[PDB]
């Protein structure tokens, strides 16, 4: 973990560097390339769907085949993925690059999350999981930030550049990620998180990607004014994801933490819908997302604890279902958004209350031994 973790985090940061990198450059490919808009729906769904199809498989052989190899193969498919996305003018290759892109995130993320769940010690494992989610978020921030930076630099460039780090992380994958030490089956124990992962990510991501739109019309934020609210939640999110390990030293379990994180987020979200002036939605917006930024490691730690082995597969189910939630969620909340502005919040409240219901059922289920 002296150098193994610092390159393992570099693999995961690199993928979300790639996912976020598409956003400021997607609406400039597909017009000068000549695309219609039904394919834009498929273009942004090919990544998610192919991530959904592969992750339960690409990560149930990773246990049997080997963690190191499937990550390294993941990067060489990651490196070639971003190369075809910026090579030349077609659509079937872009539609195939996105599918290959979903292959790379389908064999790395379940494999690497299993790997930093196998080398990390019995304690401080939640800290590494908290450290990872600090980084996947920092991938989501730096990605679109880098893509807007390489603007006058021939906008096919970010994929060459991210392709280059696909090579750089590839050599470091054989060298630095030397073979780990060495080495229930029923799916019934996996039931309660995957619906919990799906239900939240259905509603949580409904608010998240539409937060820049909900506060756009309600309190009328300037475009250089959301950025404070985005970063302020990120900083308190990042600070609390490193404060995250101390909570499990104090808290009795992870499920009890999920309930209180959800109940806390409900209370803040109720303040969020009532308050309609600038400064009492700003200061609230800093602490709206403490419940959400710090539940994603709690969910991820929940997968890695129940799965005594097959931690590639358990991380796979997280990766397939949150990608399902991040795909299904915004589409449904997009229709409900236009009847009245506050609709994604009730989805955020509703799945949060649904999240409280699900965790309470498990608590009395475990009370039944």
């Amino acid at each position, epitope marked *: 973990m002296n150098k193994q973790i610092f390159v393992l985090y570099f693999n995961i940061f690199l993928i979300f560097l790639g996912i976020g990198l598409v956003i400021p450059v997607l609406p400039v490919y597909l017009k000068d390339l000549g695309l219609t808009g039904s394919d834009l*729906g498929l273009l942004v769904a090919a990544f998610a769907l192919s991530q959904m199809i592969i992750s339960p498989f690409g990560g149930t052989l990773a246990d049997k085949l080997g963690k190191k190899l499937i990550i390294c193969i993941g990067l060489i498919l990651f490196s070639v993925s971003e190369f075809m996305f910026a090579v030349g003018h077609n659509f079937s290759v872009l539609m195939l690059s996105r599918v290959i892109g979903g292959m790379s995130a389908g064999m790395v993320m379940p494999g690497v999350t299993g790997l930093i769940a196998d080398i990390s010690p019995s304690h401080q494992k939640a800290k590494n999981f908290g450290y990872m989610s600090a980084i996947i978020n920092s991938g*989501f921030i730096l990605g679109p930030g880098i893509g807007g930076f390489m603007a006058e630099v021939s906008h096919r460039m970010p994929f060459y550049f991210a392709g280059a780090l696909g090579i750089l992380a590839f050599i470091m994958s054989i060298v630095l990620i030397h073979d780990p030490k060495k080495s229930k089956i029923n799916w019934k124990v996996f039931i309660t998180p995957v619906i919990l992962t799906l239900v939240l990510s259905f509603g949580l991501s409904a608010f998240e990607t539409l937060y820049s739109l909900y506060t756009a019309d309600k309190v009328n934020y300037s475009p250089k004014d959301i950025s404070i609210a985005i970063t302020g939640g990120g900083i308190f999110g990042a600070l609390f994801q490193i404060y995250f390990f101390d909570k499990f030293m104090k808290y009795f379990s992870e499920l009890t933490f999920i309930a209180w994180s959800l109940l806390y987020s409900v209370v803040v979200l109720i303040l969020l819908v009532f308050a309609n002036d600038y400064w009492s939605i700003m200061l609230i917006s800093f602490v709206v997302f403490i419940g959400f930024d710090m539940i994603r490691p709690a969910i991820t730690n929940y997968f890695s604890n129940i799965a005594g082995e097959r931690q590639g597969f358990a991380g796979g189910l997280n990766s397939t279902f949150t990608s399902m939630g991040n795909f299904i969620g915004p589409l449904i909340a997009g229709a*409900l958004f236009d009847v*009245h502005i506050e609709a994604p919040i009730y989805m955020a409240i509703g799945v949060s209350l649904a999240g409280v219901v699900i965790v309470l059922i498990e608590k009395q289920h475990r009370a039944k031994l």
Partner: antibody
Amino acid sequence: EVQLVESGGGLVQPGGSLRLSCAASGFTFSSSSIHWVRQAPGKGLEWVASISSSSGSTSYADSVKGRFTISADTSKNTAYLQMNSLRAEDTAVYYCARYSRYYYYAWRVGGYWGGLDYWGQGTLVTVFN
Amino acid sequence: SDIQMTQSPSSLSASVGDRVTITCRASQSVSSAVAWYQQKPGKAPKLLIYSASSLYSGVPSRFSGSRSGTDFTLTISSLQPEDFATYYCQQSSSSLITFGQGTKVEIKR
């Protein structure tokens, strides 16, 4: 991928009730809503109605509110527009557009892309006769 | 030639390959980035730039949706003989939609 064609427009008396019809083949992977953009002869566009596909909720412009009555049927996937009590300032070419608002997760930096993607050919409505 | 969102100039003449900026001042609800439509002389209007995420404005090249102060601007880097039409802003709202009056971009000679 998706083709939507409109039909029903034609001549009418100043006060008669036309009924346009905009059939649509779909599933374009977005959140749909069939608007009814209006273009007068030699003028700019002017949105005049809107139906959401799920939980249908009409929404009319300022000067054509109440006088129109828009509705949709899931069986044939069509967005009627029951005009009522017309006037010489209602002759135009009534396109039927489509709102998509494609989404992409992006943790808080969410990628969302809207716009009226797909349009009909243009059905002409003439009111004074 | 519509109203409720003044956009300037009404009609401009720009030759082949030049760089031209067209802009529209929105209402006092400046958010939900304006989408831009193109309508050739006699067909159904097309759609150039989607409504972006209001963080992604001033995109790299050839067609820029530049979220300026309180007003939105479209800059055309180079004009082919394929891009001569009228351009319309589409500012959304809580439930309704307003279209700009429309600047027609016409060939020079």
